[PDB]
């Protein structure tokens, strides 16, 4: 018998083209252009999921550095003192305390200020 | 000589920005109460500056 999968073949394209809405010009709707654009974006997304962790750690470190300099120390000295004293609070929590709970950050600094 | 690439819809529309039909310069002629082109003979009554210029029987 003769088999042509017209509906399935068209439905695959339509499903992918729902994902390329918002793109610029022909890259949103022209299919060969749109499908080309969408796959390069997927490679970018794989790379950026890895880079997001580095970016957020850098942001935490910068906020901790500013709060430590307000308290009288630097980031490297503060982190060395915390590691020596065995305090396991991570940089995300430390940055959150520095931004939003300065009294708690101050007590943490005063703990290792010796 | 030859376009290296086709123009996008955006580029074409940006060029067409200055394509516009011109509005005619229309005066009202309050006596006859209808439009005509400023500095022309009012084609309905045949008047111009309050004087019969063209007489239509």
């Amino acid at each position: 018998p003769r088999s042509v999968n017209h509906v399935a073949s068209r439905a695959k394209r339509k499903r992918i083209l729902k994902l390329t809405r918002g793109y610029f010009g022909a890259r949103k709707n022209v299919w060969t252009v749109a499908k080309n654009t969408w796959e390069k974006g997927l490679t970018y997304a794989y790379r950026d999921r890895k880079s997001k962790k580095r970016n957020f750690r850098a942001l935490w470190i910068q906020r901790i550095n500013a709060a430590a300099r307000l308290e009288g120390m630097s980031y490297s000295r503060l982190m060395g003192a915390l590691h020596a004293n065995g305090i396991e609070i991570n940089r995300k929590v430390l940055a959150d305390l520095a931004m939003n709970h300065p009294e708690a950050f101050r007590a943490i600094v005063a703990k290792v200020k010796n | 000589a030859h376009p290296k690439r086709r123009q996008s819809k955006t580029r074409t529309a940006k060029r067409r920005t200055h394509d516009k039909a011109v509005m005619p310069t229309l005066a009202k002629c309050p006596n006859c109460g209808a439009w005509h082109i400023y500095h022309t003979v009012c084609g309905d009554c045949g008047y111009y500056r309050g004087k019969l210029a063209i007489e239509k029987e």
């Binding site: - | 039909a21 011109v22 509005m23 209808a34 439009w35």
Partner: protein, 128 residues
């Protein structure tokens, strides 16, 4: 009964719209669209004067379409329109079927000529 119900809903909706259409006008949609953009949003009597004295060829057909739309409004509202009451509330120009022609070119080559048509739609309403 489904399509009958849908048609009845649409027929009730059309009673509150006042519009006229020109279909298959054998002229360039782009050149017609210039005139449409000139008169969009404008009071009807001024629009009639503008179309009467415009320097574009398409304005002559747009003027008769506008007169037809005003007449449709008058019939649907069962009264004559007053002075400055109506305005061009919507206008659009779409492309229509193209006639394809062949024109000879040097050295035996033949090139295609497109003779384009358009549709025009005009909605009038009151400046409420």
């Amino acid at each position: 009964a489904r399509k009958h119900n849908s048609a009845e809903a649409r027929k009730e909706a059309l009673k509150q719209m006042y519009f006229a259409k020109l279909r298959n006008v054998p002229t360039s949609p782009r050149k017609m669209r210039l005139v449409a953009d000139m008169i969009r949003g404008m009071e009807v009597n001024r629009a009639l004067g503008v179309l009467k004295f415009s320097n574009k060829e398409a304005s002559a057909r747009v003027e008769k379409l506008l007169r037809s739309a005003v007449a449709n409004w008058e019939e649907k509202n069962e009264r004559k329109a007053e002075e400055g009451e109506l305005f061009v509330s919507r206008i659009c120009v779409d492309g229509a079927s193209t006639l394809k022609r062949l024109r000879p070119a040097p050295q035996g080559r033949g090139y295609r000529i497109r003779k384009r048509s358009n549709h025009v739609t005009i909605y009038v309403d009151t400046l409420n």
